[PDB]
């Protein structure tokens, strides 16, 4: 069943991805697309505090930039849709130690969905429930199974256009978002073709076997936090070095200097 569980930073120059699958070397390429603007305000969410819970449902707008410097595999996937109930179709992405599962299905999501992890009395094996994420799943259309893609910052870009759902990802070692450039590589393109208006992050909680699991006293987890930003239609100038890797970019609307750079 469902269990009742319940700041801003600078984005600098993060959120650049490869616009197409064409190899280019040592060239300046201008492209109009949906990008996260430079030096924008990115919202920082503390999903779990110290235990205090706050995992809200956020709008999708024209695309989403997601970031997390987490190493405790608390964050496991995402939910996308419009009403997030049985009246419409929704998309669900779940990761674990061996695979990633993507499903377009008509789910009936709980108010506070999470993935429960159960450990055996002898510590040799465990299990994952997914019974607290949704109550029903019918009229199920799309399925996809692959290898998982989840001091270590992870960045994702989500777009939904032309009947395709596009995901780009990047993993980088760091030591609140850093400076510098790291272009996001294309991860997946799914021919899904649905409405997406809202989305919510999926977390994983462990079991405390001293109290029943239908209350907040039966689940425990560590602190988790993430960063969220939104994409807007902009013209960008990307630089491809000799190895075919994007190493710098210019936003043609940030300030008059950048506009002058793009004009030339």
């Amino acid at each position, epitope marked *: 069943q469902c269990v009742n569980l319940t700041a801003y930073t600078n984005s600098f120059t993060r959120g650049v991805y490869y616009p197409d699958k064409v190899f280019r070397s040592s060239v300046l390429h201008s492209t109009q697309d949906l990008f996260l603007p430079f030096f924008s305000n990115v919202t920082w969410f503390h999903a779990i505090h110290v235990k205090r819970f706050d995992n809200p449902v956020l709008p999708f707008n024209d695309g989403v930039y997601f970031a997390s410097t987490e190493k405790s595999n608390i964050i496991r996937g995402w939910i996308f849709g419009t009403t997030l109930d049985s009246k419409t179709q929704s998309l669900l992405i779940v990761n674990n130690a061996t695979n990633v599962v993507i499903k377009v299905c008509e789910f009936q999501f709980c108010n506070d969905p999470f993935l429960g992890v159960y450990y055996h009395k*002898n510590n040799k094996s465990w299990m994952e429930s997914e*019974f607290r994420v949704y109550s029903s799943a019918n009229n199920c259309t799309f399925e996809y199974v692959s290898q998982p893609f989840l001091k270590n910052l992870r960045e994702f870009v989500f777009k939904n256009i032309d009947g395709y759902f596009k995901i780009y990802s990047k993993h980088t070692p760091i030591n609140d978002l850093p400076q510098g450039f790291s272009a996001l590589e294309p991860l997946v393109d799914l021919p899904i073709g649905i409405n997406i208006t809202r989305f919510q992050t999926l977390l994983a909680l462990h079991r405390s*076997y001293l109290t*029943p*699991g239908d209350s907040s006293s039966g689940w425990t987890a560590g602190a988790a936090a993430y960063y969220v930003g939104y994409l807007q239609p902009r013209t960008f100038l990307l630089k491809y070095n000799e190895n075919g890797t994007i190493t710098d970019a210019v936003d043609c609307a940030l300030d008059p200097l950048s506009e002058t750079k793009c004009t030339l």
Partner: antibody
Framework: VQLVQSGAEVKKPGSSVKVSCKTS????????FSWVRQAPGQGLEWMGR????????NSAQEFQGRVTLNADKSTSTVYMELSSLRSEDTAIYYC???????????????????????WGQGTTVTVSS | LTQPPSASGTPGQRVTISCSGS????????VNWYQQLPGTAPKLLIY???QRPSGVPDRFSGSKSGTSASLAIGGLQSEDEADYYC???????????FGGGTKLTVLG
């Protein structure tokens, strides 16, 4: 939530009896079930547990090698089979749903096994000659 | 589990039923109580040692001390004559165990 059983059965000693309990779609696929027998004028007795979506079956000490519990995903039915009938095996058999966590049962924590909120109408088995 | 075979009392009073067990079943696992009218299937009254399912009034209260448990009914009503079962899980036997039947004969 409803649990529908089969009809009352009359059997001869030494034969075998099969009792069915039919459930809905979600309830069958998200629950663990127990089988409880009650003799006429006596107290309740436990016969076994079955989790159809994990393929794990527990058994009673007095019903090992004599009671077979199985399931079948189509039409969502859970079956119990009794063999080597005795003259005093006439009773009423109930299929009941656990309100606890089947994953808690799988992990080995049975501190909340014993709650049965939903029950079937009951199948009367008369074993006589 | 062990419990007395019969009980009685006058309407409007507070009656109690005991259930004594060992340390491997009652002292380690939560206790549950059931009500069974003579013409129907048993019904759950108390679970998780204190809770009541929706539709059950507030007159039924469960308690536990050490390796024994008790069920108390306040404001006894003329339609409360039935069998009450004390049920738990035994780790040694590894199975459900019921404490037997207790009958309340309400005179008046």
């Amino acid at each position: 939530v409803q649990l529908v059983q089969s009809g009352a059965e009359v059997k001869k000693p030494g034969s075998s009896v099969k009792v069915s309990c039919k459930t809905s779609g979600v309830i069958f696929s998200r629950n663990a079930f127990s089988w409880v027998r009650q003799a006429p004028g006596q107290g309740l007795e436990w016969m076994g547990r079955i989790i159809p979506f994990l393929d794990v079956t527990n058994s009673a000490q007095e019903f090992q090698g004599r009671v077979t519990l199985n399931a079948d995903k189509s039409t969502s039915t859970v079956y119990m089979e009794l063999s080597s009938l005795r003259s005093e095996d006439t009773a009423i058999y109930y299929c009941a749903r656990h309100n606890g966590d089947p994953y808690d049962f799988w992990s080995g924590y049975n501190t909340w096994a014993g709650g049965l909120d939903v029950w079937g109408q009951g199948t009367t088995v008369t074993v006589s000659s | 589990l062990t419990q007395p075979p019969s009980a009685s009392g006058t309407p409007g009073q507070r009656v109690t039923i005991s259930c004594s067990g060992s340390g491997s079943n009652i002292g380690s696992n939560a206790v549950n109580w059931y009500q069974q009218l003579p013409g129907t299937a048993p019904k759950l009254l108390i679970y998780n040692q204190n809770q009541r399912p929706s539709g059950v009034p507030d007159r039924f209260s469960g308690s536990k001390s050490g390796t024994s448990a008790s069920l108390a009914i306040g404001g006894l009503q003329s339609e409360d004559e039935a069998d009450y079962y004390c049920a738990t899980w035994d780790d040694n036997l590894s199975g459900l165990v019921f404490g037997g039947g207790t009958k309340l004969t309400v005179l008046g």
